Design an enzyme around this catalytic site. Structure first.
Site, PDB file in Angstrom:
ATOM      1  N   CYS A 267       0.736  -1.263   0.162  1.00 51.01           N
ATOM      2  CA  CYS A 267       0.028   0.077  -0.077  1.00 51.01           C
ATOM      3  C   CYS A 267       0.662   1.287   0.013  1.00 51.01           C
ATOM      4  O   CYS A 267       0.414   2.167  -0.831  1.00 51.01           O
ATOM      5  CB  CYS A 267      -1.134   0.122   0.992  1.00 51.01           C
ATOM      6  N   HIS A 327      -2.460   2.188   7.006  1.00 48.59           N
ATOM      7  CA  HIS A 327      -2.866   2.209   5.575  1.00 48.59           C
ATOM      8  C   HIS A 327      -2.773   3.434   4.928  1.00 48.59           C
ATOM      9  O   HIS A 327      -3.348   4.380   5.364  1.00 48.59           O
ATOM     10  CB  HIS A 327      -4.065   1.354   5.136  1.00 48.59           C
ATOM     11  N   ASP A 350      -7.372   6.103  -3.839  1.00 44.33           N
ATOM     12  CA  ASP A 350      -6.469   4.693  -3.150  1.00 44.33           C
ATOM     13  C   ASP A 350      -6.199   3.592  -4.459  1.00 44.33           C
ATOM     14  O   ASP A 350      -6.718   3.051  -4.816  1.00 44.33           O
ATOM     15  CB  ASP A 350      -7.280   4.038  -2.178  1.00 44.33           C
ATOM     16  N   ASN A 390     -13.993   4.894   9.252  1.00 44.25           N
ATOM     17  CA  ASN A 390     -15.118   4.749  10.111  1.00 44.25           C
ATOM     18  C   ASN A 390     -15.892   3.292  10.567  1.00 44.25           C
ATOM     19  O   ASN A 390     -16.703   3.406  11.651  1.00 44.25           O
ATOM     20  CB  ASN A 390     -16.288   5.709   9.587  1.00 44.25           C
ATOM     21  N   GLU A 429       1.498  16.137  10.117  1.00 45.48           N
ATOM     22  CA  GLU A 429       0.361  16.982  10.426  1.00 45.48           C
ATOM     23  C   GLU A 429      -0.648  16.093  10.359  1.00 45.48           C
ATOM     24  O   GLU A 429      -0.974  15.310   9.777  1.00 45.48           O
ATOM     25  CB  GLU A 429       0.420  17.825   8.970  1.00 45.48           C
TER      26      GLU A 429
END
Length: 666
Positions: A267, A327, A350, A390, A429
């Site tokens: 990834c 990820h 992604d 989520n 950040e």
């Protein structure tokens, strides 16, 4: 017969278009911004003769544009012509919706009746996205962010675990030789371009389309994709993912080999390579990392995870252990005219295929705002991206009689410290709030409600002193009874090796204790993990997932992932550095392993410093012995540059170092 030579003035145009880092000898321009070239003539435009300009795009002229003579439309290409001395200054004006690509320019001189009296040499040029041009869809109104998100070639990708974050520098190298040419090659080898070349070219003016195409080619595309994914350790016929320190070697290899998936990637390597290419084409991009990633869930916002009483997944065969340690993906800046008002800005792309349609479905472009507000109805792949950050996984102890006991968990939550590199400095950040409302907020409650996210004393905790790979160490599991009455409970602890993508490996020890912890007091138990035990099960990332269950007199759980450290390379390149001036870089470390490591290879690279280069340690580094190599090279470009180094050996893997070297020469 008048045109003696067309001059693209690339040193100049390229300076003005922020494309000269790529090349000075060839005209590389950005859209929506004019460029000036000259026609050196031998004499003069024959009286009733005038100039005509037509553009050609595509290996077979899939697209041809006749450029207007003046006061053109806004989305229309047009030119202004003016005489200098013995040459004609031609300023080409391109629309801000111009198709990116390699154009070939044909300047025609013609008779007043309609016939070509002469045609000048067709010169070519490349066209990229222009985030500095206010009418361009990728327009970002802050020059300081475009410097980081488009112009910066050195980044930092975050990794590790959310409570123990590590940084790995990356050489995006988007302006290294030929990386631009390969970027257009990736666009040229996509299914669409192969199926219908002309339609594909016509769609290349769209940052949404091009972003979705690049994201798709990085890995998901199996026959011509850029990288081959390998999620577990025997990386037999290729380079292990944890080896790469930059994107250029993967891209040169893919193209050099005739467009052949490179072995292998994971990834964060897909995201970094996506970043290099989109930054190169001109779309503002930054690699973002998610800790506690619900990638595995395959878009489901509700998962009940069944364990047995021994704390194990009900099916011994199943090796995956929930959420990933982290990820990575990429965020690209662009306006979304293809969707309702409000989804403009950063979009999540992604490259990592989605769980359950095998290495087939990449994600995005998806508005990060659609995630924040819970609108799963916009393209592309909002449900999957909203789950990633989520999804609700509830663990259960299901007994042999079917009684399911809900495990209460303190460590909880997915999408923990979404991170991206800072625009100033190499600081992390925390970008979490761009993705989600704070936990518990009523705002969080109404978005979860809208999107379908289910919306619902003894204290267990695991602690460690950040162990170094090679050593035996202790991990404390502390039960804090902050209650008034004494509490007796059963404390189960296990320590098993793991992979970042939660692939369970070697259970290097378990243990159950009976505990009675007094009011307002805390019981501390220790688990000693040993090298000769965990070398057997741990991987290149050296990870150990520790879990503790406290069957409270329901049950309480807490998990911890321990990343065991590798030594940090000492990279030094002493004395003032000057462009094209030979210098010597020095890397050195000490074997922390009481074993000799052999096959020691150092690989060095740096955007503007050098292309990946190897130094093979001749011999085997003795147990606890210091290793020391050096390489000589001459920087290629001036500037504040970063030198990256990787070290691999049979027993010591995943060893890095970076140093900052200011390259001079006014």
């Amino acid at each position: 017969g008048l045109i003696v030579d067309v001059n693209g003035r690339s040193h100049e145009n390229n300076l003005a278009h922020r494309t000269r880092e790529i090349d000075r000898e060839r005209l590389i321009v950005r859209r929506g911004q004019p460029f000036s070239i000259t026609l050196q003539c031998s004499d003069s435009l024959p009286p009733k003769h005038h100039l005509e300009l037509v553009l050609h795009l595509g290996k077979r002229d899939e697209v041809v544009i006749k450029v207007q003579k003046e006061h053109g439309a806004r989305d229309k290409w047009w030119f202004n012509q003016q005489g200098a001395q013995d040459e004609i200054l031609l300023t080409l004006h391109s629309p801000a919706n111009a198709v990116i690509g390699h154009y070939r320019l044909a300047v025609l001189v013609m008779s007043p009746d309609g016939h070509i009296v002469e045609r000048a040499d067709k010169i070519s040029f490349h066209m990229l996205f222009n985030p500095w041009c206010r009418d361009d869809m990728v327009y970002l109104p802050d020059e300081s962010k475009l410097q980081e998100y488009v112009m910066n070639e050195d980044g930092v990708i975050y990794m590790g675990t959310w409570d123990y974050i590590r940084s790995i520098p990356w050489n995006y190298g988007q302006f290294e030789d030929y990386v631009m040419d390969i970027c257009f090659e990736v666009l040229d080898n996509s299914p669409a371009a192969l199926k219908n070349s002309e339609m594909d070219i016509e769609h290349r003016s769209d940052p949404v389309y091009v972003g979705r195409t690049i994201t798709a080619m990085v890995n998901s595309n199996g026959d011509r994709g850029v990288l081959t994914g390998r999620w577990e350790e025997p990386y037999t016929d290729g380079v292990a993912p944890y080896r790469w320190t930059g994107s250029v070697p993967i891209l040169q290899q893919w193209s050099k080999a005739g467009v052949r998936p490179v072995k292998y990637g994971q990834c964060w390597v897909f995201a970094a390579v996506a970043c290099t290419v989109l930054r190169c084409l001109g779309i503002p991009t930054r690699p973002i990392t998610n800790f506690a990633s619900a990638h595995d869930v395959d878009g489901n916002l509700s998962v009940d995870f069944l364990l047995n009483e021994r704390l194990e997944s009900l099916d011994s065969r199943q090796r995956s252990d929930s959420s990933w340690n982290f990820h990575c993906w990429v965020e690209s800046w662009m306006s979304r005219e293809d969707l309702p008002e409000g989804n403009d800005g950063w979009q999540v792309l992604d490259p990592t295929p989605q769980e359950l349609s095998d290495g087939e479905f990449c994600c995005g472009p998806c508005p990060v705002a659609a995630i924040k507000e819970g609108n799963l109805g916009v393209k592309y792949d909002a449900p999957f991206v909203f789950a990633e950050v989520n999804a609700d996984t509830i663990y259960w102890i299901v007994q042999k009689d079917g009684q399911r006991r809900k495990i209460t968990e303190d460590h909880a939550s997915v999408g923990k410290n979404i991170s991206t590199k800072s625009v100033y400095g190499n600081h992390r950040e925390d970008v979490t709030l761009h993705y989600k409302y704070p936990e518990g907020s009523q705002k969080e409650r109404e978005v979860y409600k809208k999107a379908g996210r289910r919306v619902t004393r003894l204290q267990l905790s695991i602690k460690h002193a950040q162990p170094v790979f090679g050593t035996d160490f202790d991990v404390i599991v502390e039960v804090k009874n902050e209650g008034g009455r004494d509490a007796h409970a059963q404390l189960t602890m296990l320590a098993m090796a793991v992979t970042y993508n939660s692939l369970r490996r070697g259970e290097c020890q378990r243990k159950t204790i009976s505990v009675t912890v007094p009011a307002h007091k805390a019981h501390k138990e220790v688990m000693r993990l040993h090298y000769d035990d965990y070398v057997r099960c741990v991987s290149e990332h050296h990870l150990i997932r520790v879990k503790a269950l406290l069957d409270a007199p329901g049950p309480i759980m807490t998990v911890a992932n321990i990343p065991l450290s590798t030594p940090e390379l000492l990279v030094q390149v002493p004395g003032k550095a000057v462009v094209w001036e030979p210098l010597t870089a020095y890397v050195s470390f000490t074997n922390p392993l009481p074993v000799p490591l052999k096959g020691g290879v150092f690989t060095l690279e740096g955007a503007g410093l050098l292309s990946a280069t190897q130094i093979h340690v001749n011999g085997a580094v003795a147990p606890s012995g210091k290793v020391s190599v050096k390489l000589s090279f001459s920087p290629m470009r001036t500037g504040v540059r970063k030198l990256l180094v990787d070290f691999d050996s049979d027993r010591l893997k995943d060893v890095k170092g970076v140093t900052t070297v200011v390259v001079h020469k006014k």
